[PDB]
Design a protein around this ligand. Structure first.
Ligand SMILES: NC[C@@H]1O[C@H](O[C@H]2[C@@H](O)[C@H](O[C@@H]3[C@@H](O)[C@H](N)C[C@H](N)[C@H]3O[C@H]3O[C@H](CO)[C@@H](O)[C@H](O)[C@H]3N)O[C@@H]2CO)[C@H](N)[C@@H](O)[C@@H]1O
Ligand SMILES: [K+]
Ligand SMILES: [K+]
Ligand SMILES: [K+]
Ligand SMILES: [K+]
Ligand SMILES: [K+]
Ligand SMILES: [K+]
Ligand SMILES: [K+]
Ligand SMILES: [K+]
Ligand SMILES: [K+]
Ligand SMILES: [K+]
Ligand SMILES: [K+]
Ligand SMILES: [K+]
Ligand SMILES: [K+]
Ligand SMILES: [K+]
Ligand SMILES: [K+]
Ligand SMILES: [K+]
Ligand SMILES: [K+]
Ligand SMILES: [K+]
Ligand SMILES: [K+]
Ligand SMILES: [K+]
Ligand SMILES: [K+]
Ligand SMILES: [K+]
Ligand SMILES: [K+]
Ligand SMILES: [K+]
Ligand SMILES: [K+]
Ligand SMILES: [K+]
Ligand SMILES: [K+]
Ligand SMILES: [K+]
Ligand SMILES: [K+]
Ligand SMILES: [K+]
Ligand SMILES: [K+]
Ligand SMILES: [K+]
Ligand SMILES: [K+]
Ligand SMILES: [K+]
Ligand SMILES: [K+]
Ligand SMILES: [K+]
Ligand SMILES: [K+]
Ligand SMILES: [K+]
Ligand SMILES: [Mg+2]
Ligand SMILES: [Mg+2]
Ligand SMILES: [Mg+2]
Ligand SMILES: [Mg+2]
Ligand SMILES: [Mg+2]
Ligand SMILES: [Mg+2]
Ligand SMILES: [Mg+2]
Ligand SMILES: [Mg+2]
Ligand SMILES: [Mg+2]
Ligand SMILES: [Mg+2]
Ligand SMILES: [Mg+2]
Ligand SMILES: [Mg+2]
Ligand SMILES: [Mg+2]
Ligand SMILES: [Mg+2]
Ligand SMILES: [Mg+2]
Ligand SMILES: [Mg+2]
Ligand SMILES: [Mg+2]
Ligand SMILES: [Mg+2]
Ligand SMILES: [Mg+2]
Ligand SMILES: [Mg+2]
Ligand SMILES: [Mg+2]
Ligand SMILES: [Mg+2]
Ligand SMILES: [Mg+2]
Ligand SMILES: [Mg+2]
Ligand SMILES: [Mg+2]
Ligand SMILES: [Mg+2]
Ligand SMILES: [Mg+2]
Ligand SMILES: [Mg+2]
Ligand SMILES: [Mg+2]
Ligand SMILES: [Mg+2]
Ligand SMILES: [Mg+2]
Ligand SMILES: [Mg+2]
Ligand SMILES: [Mg+2]
Ligand SMILES: [Mg+2]
Ligand SMILES: [Mg+2]
Ligand SMILES: [Mg+2]
Ligand SMILES: [Mg+2]
Ligand SMILES: [Mg+2]
Ligand SMILES: [Mg+2]
Ligand SMILES: [Mg+2]
Ligand SMILES: [Mg+2]
Ligand SMILES: [Mg+2]
Ligand SMILES: [Mg+2]
Ligand SMILES: [Mg+2]
Ligand SMILES: [Mg+2]
Ligand SMILES: [Mg+2]
Ligand SMILES: [Mg+2]
Ligand SMILES: [Mg+2]
Ligand SMILES: [Mg+2]
Ligand SMILES: [Mg+2]
Ligand SMILES: [Mg+2]
Ligand SMILES: [Mg+2]
Ligand SMILES: [Mg+2]
Ligand SMILES: [Mg+2]
Ligand SMILES: [Mg+2]
Ligand SMILES: [Mg+2]
Ligand SMILES: [Mg+2]
Ligand SMILES: [Mg+2]
Ligand SMILES: [Mg+2]
Ligand SMILES: [Mg+2]
Ligand SMILES: [Mg+2]
Ligand SMILES: [Mg+2]
Ligand SMILES: [Mg+2]
Ligand SMILES: [Mg+2]
Ligand SMILES: [Mg+2]
Ligand SMILES: [Mg+2]
Ligand SMILES: [Mg+2]
Ligand SMILES: [Mg+2]
Ligand SMILES: [Mg+2]
Ligand SMILES: [Mg+2]
Ligand SMILES: [Mg+2]
Ligand SMILES: [Mg+2]
Ligand SMILES: [Mg+2]
Ligand SMILES: [Mg+2]
Ligand SMILES: [Mg+2]
Ligand SMILES: [Mg+2]
Ligand SMILES: [Mg+2]
Ligand SMILES: [Mg+2]
Ligand SMILES: [Mg+2]
Ligand SMILES: [Mg+2]
Ligand SMILES: [Mg+2]
Ligand SMILES: [Mg+2]
Ligand SMILES: [Mg+2]
Ligand SMILES: [Mg+2]
Ligand SMILES: [Mg+2]
Ligand SMILES: [Mg+2]
Ligand SMILES: [Mg+2]
Ligand SMILES: [Mg+2]
Ligand SMILES: [Mg+2]
Ligand SMILES: [Mg+2]
Ligand SMILES: [Mg+2]
Ligand SMILES: [Mg+2]
Ligand SMILES: [Mg+2]
Ligand SMILES: [Mg+2]
Ligand SMILES: [Mg+2]
Ligand SMILES: [Mg+2]
Ligand SMILES: [Mg+2]
Ligand SMILES: [Mg+2]
Ligand SMILES: [Mg+2]
Ligand SMILES: [Mg+2]
Ligand SMILES: [Mg+2]
Ligand SMILES: [Mg+2]
Ligand SMILES: [Mg+2]
Ligand SMILES: [Mg+2]
Ligand SMILES: [Mg+2]
Ligand SMILES: [Mg+2]
Ligand SMILES: [Mg+2]
Ligand SMILES: [Mg+2]
Ligand SMILES: [Mg+2]
Ligand SMILES: [Mg+2]
Ligand SMILES: [Mg+2]
Ligand SMILES: [Mg+2]
Ligand SMILES: [Mg+2]
Ligand SMILES: [Mg+2]
Ligand SMILES: [Mg+2]
Ligand SMILES: [Mg+2]
Ligand SMILES: [Mg+2]
Ligand SMILES: [Mg+2]
Ligand SMILES: [Mg+2]
Ligand SMILES: [Mg+2]
Lengths: 138, 124
RNA sequence: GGCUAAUCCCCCAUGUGGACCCGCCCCUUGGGGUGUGUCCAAAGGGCUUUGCCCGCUUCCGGAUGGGCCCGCGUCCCAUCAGCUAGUUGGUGGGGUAAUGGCCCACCAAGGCGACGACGGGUAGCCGGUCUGAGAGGAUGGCCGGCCACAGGGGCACUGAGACACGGGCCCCACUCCUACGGGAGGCAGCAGUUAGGAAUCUUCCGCAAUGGGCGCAAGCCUGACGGAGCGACGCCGCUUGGAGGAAGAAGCCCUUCGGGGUGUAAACUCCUGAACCCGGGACGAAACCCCCGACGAGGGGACUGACGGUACCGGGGUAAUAGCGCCGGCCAACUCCGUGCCAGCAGCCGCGGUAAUACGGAGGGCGCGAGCGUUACCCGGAUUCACUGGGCGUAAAGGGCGUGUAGGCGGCCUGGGGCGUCCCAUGUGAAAGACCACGGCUCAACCGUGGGGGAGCGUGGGAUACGCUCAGGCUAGACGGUGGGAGAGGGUGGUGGAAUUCCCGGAGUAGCGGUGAAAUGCGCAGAUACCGGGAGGAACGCCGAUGGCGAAGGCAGCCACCUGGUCCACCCGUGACGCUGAGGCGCGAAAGCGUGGGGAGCAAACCGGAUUAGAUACCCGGGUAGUCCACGCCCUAAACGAUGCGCGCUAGGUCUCUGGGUCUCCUGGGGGCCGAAGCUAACGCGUUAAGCGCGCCGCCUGGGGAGUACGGCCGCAAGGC
RNA sequence: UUCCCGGGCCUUGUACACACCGCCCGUCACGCCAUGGGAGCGGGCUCUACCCGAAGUCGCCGGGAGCCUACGGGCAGGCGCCGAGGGUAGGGCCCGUGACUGGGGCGAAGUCGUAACAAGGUAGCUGUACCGGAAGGUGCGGCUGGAUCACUUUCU
């Protein structure tokens, strides 16, 4: 089995985008889906949808990129330049609202998991709560 | 190492070892000169350097460089040593303070006088 | 021995009350109430003397101070791994203000430890302090808090309180007194002496102020303290002058010998005027007390200054200390002379052996300035122990491999709980310090007032995504079934042919052998070469590979038996049963060791022949251990892919081994090569990762000393870890 | 065109770079220094057993043996447990010194050969084992981190 399904996902995505895949499938879990929603809403992916690869539930994650480019190497810029796991089995990271980070002076996001559900570093700061710092994305 | 490992063994702090067992850390130590030889520098250099075996109050005996143009240290001179090796004479790690006790200051010195115990040239 | 007072001791009484035993009630560990029984009080003094003051007794409560207990936190060494008998607990006592093995009887046989017991080292802890962007590192001096000690060890007495620094008792070491029996003493109080040391002050003034003890008070005591003294030891403030002065004195230093520099710097001119001399001269000090009032509230008056004739104000008034380091790069500042691997410099790199910006001096210059340098030590830079924030193919670093304990980590869905996690409120977080603001000394240092923070912990309430836990469910992980497959995987027994050596027989004759060339050697007791027969040991040609099997080491004729791993198909069964794995256990090439056996060939040592300058080698002829088998040890290695195991993700092309399929091709497992993206110091790696990621283990931290020494463990030893 | 000398181009190995007349290894000699083992002789700690045991609290006695007494009891005194400390025997650890002894680091120009680096002139390295003035040689097995296609010959 996978030891960390969220990191598995964050990477399937990190990988897929580096070779400009169209979409990418990841085994499904409510928690994973919950993270995609933030991912979608903040405009990092085009969105996702439940599908059934073989006989088991996955989540096509439609990736998104910038426009073709000039000079050598026309490959487009990435929407997801950076996506990294923070809390991990073996080293869970929890923060208080006063301790929620600020990814790239705001140009990026942190996805916390609170008792008020999965939120971004703002949705969390707004609702005045903290929790498990899941990852940062920019 | 894994975090579990750092939790199990942790990092190990670096213990810095001295280059001046002038004991008590002390800035200086007093001693009496046993021998008052001369030594040959290593490879790149050549000359007759003035050293001095010293028996310290520290309860130690070590060679100490005698800086300056010319000295006056016999076999029973009361000397004060300080840290400071001499890169050329392996084994010499301290300097005698010219201007304290028996080791007279350097004469006709006019530049770096304080470093050689030579009082401000009289007259105007 | 004798006399004697009391707020000294005792007896009887009174009993608000309180203590004790027993019972009852509430309450809940010994808290509060109630009843009977018993037990327990006291001190007088002064008067402005018959009414106040000071004091006494018992009890309840407050306030302050403190004892004991508990959670969590608190350095180094595992080259310290087992520790423990009052030890762990129980019953009953003793003891105390009080719980408790605190102590004692008796009973039980427990308690502690890799989450580091026990042992060894080191050390008062904290608020804070220094450093750092922070995290962190280092640190605990002054000041404030707690602890401990008072020559060293032990002990109790008195008391609200001590096991008592200037109280007592004993032992010990020391100093002093001694009419030798025996006594006296303890500066880690202030000041001072001496010793040690690189180094740390006055045998000062005062009790005026704040604080303390006793007293009704007057007041006494206070080396606590308030001051002064010494030391640039630190911090802050200040002075050694200000303005004008030559297309620029002299001297000195360079020079292209024209001139350039020190430099408006100096002399001079004018101005101010630190020091010093006069005059004045303080805040800190208003209470205690006395008078009025009521000994209260309130009002009034008096005394009191160590610092000190100091601060400060006013008058007068001189132009009057500058040093230290550095100038090759890092690093700001350059020239002449001197010296010639010398004398010397040196933080690192290095500099000096005839024209040295690096040694020494001088001129000039940079830096800083009552200081400047040096040494020592702490943090920094050092993401160089990397939590923030590092690494291990070839740089130091993957454990020789497996099995597996603890531990760390854990797929999808639902539910309860709410330990972690998060939120709110609240308490706590002393003062000083730190931060901000305003303010007091002419400023500042310093100081006052005020404000703002703060992690952690306690309490109450709340949330439930993630982690945890419990309960239920699932099949995508893992395992199992059925049917197929490939293989030098392992163990035991048997067995085949080639060759070498030896022995026997035949036939045959002068050499064979060996090298660069030779010789030693073997051969007429007939060798070599050839044929036939026999014995024995060891190893398996071709197939054979660029191949296969195994966890590694490793595994190769053929046959049988016993036995391990593994791949594919079918989706059949279980239902997260998983990954990793400190220690443990097992395996582990060669050489080597022990016992016994074997011994053809080969061959350390060794014996000889050559070679060479020598030749304890290379070459040649011999040859013992060993190489082989059994059993038992050893436990190493370039034990290598120099690449730990597992899982998911990220172009392809090509060769190949083994399986399945609709069999040009597809699909699974393994072995190679070239390469996408990406990674890498580069080389290179690249679905067989050295890519992108998660989990767990092992390991690295400059080189030599050294895989050494010591210790421990293991081994018969060699020697291993 | 094999060989000797000089040279040109490509390639390969290299530990060389005032560049093979390069580099470099170990023994030994000389000097300075730190250090291991170590008979014995000193100093210290600690633990076990047995023995002696001050002060003091506590316990028992306190009697025709003492003092007080309102006869209840108190004090003196005595004995005992514990007890600082000391002694003896043994056990373990540390420390100073130490005859004798092992190797090590460092020090311009001493000695011996030539092991390594190029196929280093016998490829090297390696674990082990024996042997040798020294580097090292040889045996067995392993590795590639070995050059090309297939007499011997030191040094600077
Ligand atoms: N210090 C080197 C160590 O000892 C040995 O080396 C030592 C000796 O072999 C060596 O001696 C050399 C000699 O080899 C060479 N052929 C001649 C030279 N004169 C000697 O030199 C030695 O002695 C002289 C005085 O005579 C000193 O001035 C010099 O500094 C010193 N190294 O000097 C070393 C001592 O300094 C090891 N071989 C070496 O691997 C190890 O690292
Ligand atoms: K009397
Ligand atoms: K009563
Ligand atoms: K009270
Ligand atoms: K109280
Ligand atoms: K209390
Ligand atoms: K008890
Ligand atoms: K930080
Ligand atoms: K600290
Ligand atoms: K500390
Ligand atoms: K601290
Ligand atoms: K009073
Ligand atoms: K009054
Ligand atoms: K004045
Ligand atoms: K002047
Ligand atoms: K000259
Ligand atoms: K020169
Ligand atoms: K110069
Ligand atoms: K100079
Ligand atoms: K540092
Ligand atoms: K290794
Ligand atoms: K091992
Ligand atoms: K729940
Ligand atoms: K700070
Ligand atoms: K709280
Ligand atoms: K092969
Ligand atoms: K042997
Ligand atoms: K064998
Ligand atoms: K064995
Ligand atoms: K097929
Ligand atoms: K590259
Ligand atoms: K290559
Ligand atoms: K040992
Ligand atoms: K042994
Ligand atoms: K061994
Ligand atoms: K020829
Ligand atoms: K050696
Ligand atoms: K009696
Ligand atoms: K190399
Ligand atoms: Mg030189
Ligand atoms: Mg120094
Ligand atoms: Mg100088
Ligand atoms: Mg009397
Ligand atoms: Mg009563
Ligand atoms: Mg009651
Ligand atoms: Mg009652
Ligand atoms: Mg009665
Ligand atoms: Mg009474
Ligand atoms: Mg009266
Ligand atoms: Mg009790
Ligand atoms: Mg009690
Ligand atoms: Mg006890
Ligand atoms: Mg036991
Ligand atoms: Mg101490
Ligand atoms: Mg830092
Ligand atoms: Mg700071
Ligand atoms: Mg800090
Ligand atoms: Mg203090
Ligand atoms: Mg003393
Ligand atoms: Mg009292
Ligand atoms: Mg006292
Ligand atoms: Mg005390
Ligand atoms: Mg005293
Ligand atoms: Mg002295
Ligand atoms: Mg006073
Ligand atoms: Mg007073
Ligand atoms: Mg001039
Ligand atoms: Mg002027
Ligand atoms: Mg004037
Ligand atoms: Mg008074
Ligand atoms: Mg009156
Ligand atoms: Mg009155
Ligand atoms: Mg008044
Ligand atoms: Mg400069
Ligand atoms: Mg000259
Ligand atoms: Mg000279
Ligand atoms: Mg010169
Ligand atoms: Mg210059
Ligand atoms: Mg310089
Ligand atoms: Mg650091
Ligand atoms: Mg890290
Ligand atoms: Mg590194
Ligand atoms: Mg390496
Ligand atoms: Mg390995
Ligand atoms: Mg395993
Ligand atoms: Mg497990
Ligand atoms: Mg889970
Ligand atoms: Mg678990
Ligand atoms: Mg909770
Ligand atoms: Mg709080
Ligand atoms: Mg505070
Ligand atoms: Mg002000
Ligand atoms: Mg304040
Ligand atoms: Mg907070
Ligand atoms: Mg709470
Ligand atoms: Mg709930
Ligand atoms: Mg749950
Ligand atoms: Mg379940
Ligand atoms: Mg099968
Ligand atoms: Mg086989
Ligand atoms: Mg045969
Ligand atoms: Mg014959
Ligand atoms: Mg015949
Ligand atoms: Mg013959
Ligand atoms: Mg004949
Ligand atoms: Mg014969
Ligand atoms: Mg024959
Ligand atoms: Mg035959
Ligand atoms: Mg035979
Ligand atoms: Mg394999
Ligand atoms: Mg192999
Ligand atoms: Mg099988
Ligand atoms: Mg099924
Ligand atoms: Mg089922
Ligand atoms: Mg073996
Ligand atoms: Mg063997
Ligand atoms: Mg044998
Ligand atoms: Mg044998
Ligand atoms: Mg035999
Ligand atoms: Mg032979
Ligand atoms: Mg010969
Ligand atoms: Mg031979
Ligand atoms: Mg290999
Ligand atoms: Mg792909
Ligand atoms: Mg392929
Ligand atoms: Mg493949
Ligand atoms: Mg294939
Ligand atoms: Mg293969
Ligand atoms: Mg590329
Ligand atoms: Mg390149
Ligand atoms: Mg490749
Ligand atoms: Mg992978
Ligand atoms: Mg290691
Ligand atoms: Mg080292
Ligand atoms: Mg070192
Ligand atoms: Mg080392
Ligand atoms: Mg070894
Ligand atoms: Mg053994
Ligand atoms: Mg030629
Ligand atoms: Mg040519
Ligand atoms: Mg040409
Ligand atoms: Mg080339
Ligand atoms: Mg060439
Ligand atoms: Mg010794
Ligand atoms: Mg006794
Ligand atoms: Mg007694
Ligand atoms: Mg008695
Ligand atoms: Mg005793
Ligand atoms: Mg060789
Ligand atoms: Mg050679
Ligand atoms: Mg060679
Ligand atoms: Mg040669
Ligand atoms: Mg050879
Ligand atoms: Mg060779
Ligand atoms: Mg080689
Ligand atoms: Mg060998
Ligand atoms: Mg030999
Ligand atoms: Mg070999
Ligand atoms: Mg040569």
């Amino acid at each position: 089995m996978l030891t960390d399904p969220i990191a598995d996902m964050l990477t399937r995505i990190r990988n897929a985008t580096r070779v400009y895949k169209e979409s990418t499938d990841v085994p499904a879990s409510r928690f994973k889906e919950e993270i995609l929603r933030i991912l979608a809403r903040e405009g990092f992916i085009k969105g996702y949808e439940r599908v059934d690869v073989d006989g088991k539930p996955y989540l096509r994650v439609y990736l998104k990129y910038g426009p073709r480019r000039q000079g050598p190497d026309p490959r487009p810029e990435q929407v997801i330049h950076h996506i990294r796991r923070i809390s991990k089995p073996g080293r869970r990271v929890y923060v208080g609202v006063k301790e929620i980070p600020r990814v790239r002076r705001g140009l990026g996001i942190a996805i916390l998991s609170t008792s008020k559900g999965v939120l971004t570093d703002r949705e969390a700061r707004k609702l005045g709560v903290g929790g498990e710092l899941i990852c940062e994305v920019w | 190492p894994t975090i579990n490992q750092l939790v199990r063994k942790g990092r190990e702090k670096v213990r810095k070892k001295s280059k001046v067992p002038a004991l008590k850390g002390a800035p200086f130590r007093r001693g009496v000169c046993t021998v008052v030889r001369t030594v040959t520098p290593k490879k790149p250099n050549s000359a007759l350097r003035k050293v001095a075996k010293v028996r310290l109050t520290s309860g130690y005996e070590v060679t100490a460089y005698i800086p300056g143009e010319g000295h006056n240290l016999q076999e029973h001179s009361v000397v004060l040593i300080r840290g400071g090796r001499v890169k050329d004479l392996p084994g010499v790690r301290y300097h005698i303070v010219r201007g304290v006790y028996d080791a007279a200051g350097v004469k006709d010195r006019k530049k770096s006088r304080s470093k050689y115990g030579t009082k401000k040239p009289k007259e105007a």
